[PDB]
Amino acid sequence: GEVITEQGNVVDHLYFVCEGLLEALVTKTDGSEESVTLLGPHTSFGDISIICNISQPFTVRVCELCHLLRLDKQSFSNILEIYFHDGRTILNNIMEEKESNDRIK
C-alpha cells in the first residue's frame, strides 16, 4: 500500500517485482483510475517508459509486501548499447511479452 510510480513520470528507475501483486491503475482524467491490477510475483512495472520513451503509462501503488529489483535507466541503456543485438532482442521480447498481454498503451 505505497504509491511508487505515478503517470506521466519520466522514470530513470524501472522496477522488477518479486513479492506480492500491484495495481497499475491508469489514472483516468475524469477523476477515478483504471483500477488495473499490476501482475506481481515474477513480473515488473515502471519499465515501459524506459523501453520506448513514453511517459509513465500507469500509476502503480504497492498492494502487497513487495521486494523489488529497481533498475536504473542509465546503466540499463548502457548495457543495451554494449550488448546491441542482445538489446534489440530484449526490445523484441518486450513486444512479444505484451503482444499476448494486450497492454493498454
Count the neighbouring beta carbons within 10 Å of the beta carbon of residue 27: 15
**Residue 81 assigned as binding residue:** yes
C-alpha cell at 79: 548495457
Helix (H) or strand (E) holding 35: none
Q: According to the binding rule CB under 8 A, does residue 96 interact with its own copies?
A: no
| d(C-alpha 26, C-alpha 9), whole Å | 12
Residue choice 53, 99, 100, 102 for contact with its own copies (CB under 8 A)? 53
Q: According to the binding rule CB under 8 A, does residue 5 interact with its own copies?
A: yes
Residue choice 35, 78, 92, 101 for contact with its own copies (CB under 8 A)? 78
| d(C-alpha 56, C-alpha 10), whole Å | 7
Nearest residue to 97 (alpha-carbon basis) of 27, 37, 48: 48
Range in contact with its own copies (rule: CB under 8 A) among 6-14, 34-42, 95-103: 6-14
Q: Which residues bind its own copies (CB under 8 A)?
A: 1-5, 7-8, 10, 12-13, 27, 29-32, 53-55, 64-65, 68, 70, 73-75, 78-79, 81-86
Binding residues for a nucleoside 3',5'-cyclic phosphate, as ranges, are: 1-99
